[PDB]
Amino acid sequence: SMSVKKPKRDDSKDLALCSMILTEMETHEDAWPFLLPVNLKLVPGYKKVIKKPMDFSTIREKLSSGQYPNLETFALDVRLVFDNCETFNEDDSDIGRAGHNMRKYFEKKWTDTFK
């Protein structure tokens, strides 16, 4: 509260570390469905159904331009990518499997780097 603060957690490396994680996600072999924004002209249903599209290139641009205020807003956008993928894709599809694999991969790196 006013004039009463928990001890300062060092966040000075968060930007670099989120960039490293994102690089690892970009280079994963199962990243291909997620590298670029879904083409809203060419994929029926996407525009109406997925209210907040997100992809790794869009996260990279936000990261590089100071549009994440803290490491939690970064994780929210990464998870949005996978939540969108589960909304639109069957679990038993190449893309559906890719999204589960990538979510697992991300959540481990996240825990190991920050928790």
DSSP 58-81: HHHHHHHTT--SSHHHHHHHHHHH
CA distance 70 to 66: 10
Q: Please say whether the beta carbons of 84 and 33 come within 8 A.
A: no
Resolution (A): 1.7
Give the Cβ contact number of residue 19 at 10 Å.
14
Domains of the chain in sequence order? 1-115 (1.20.920.10)
Tell me the backbone φ, ψ of residue 59, rounded to 5 degrees.
Answer: -60, -45
- Nearest to 15, CA basis, from 54, 63, 52: 63
Q: Please say whether the beta carbons of 32 and 102 come within 8 A.
A: no
3-state DSSP: the chain helix, strand, coil percent, rounded to 5? 65, 0, 35
Q: What angle do CA 90, 57, 40 make, to 5 degrees?
A: 55
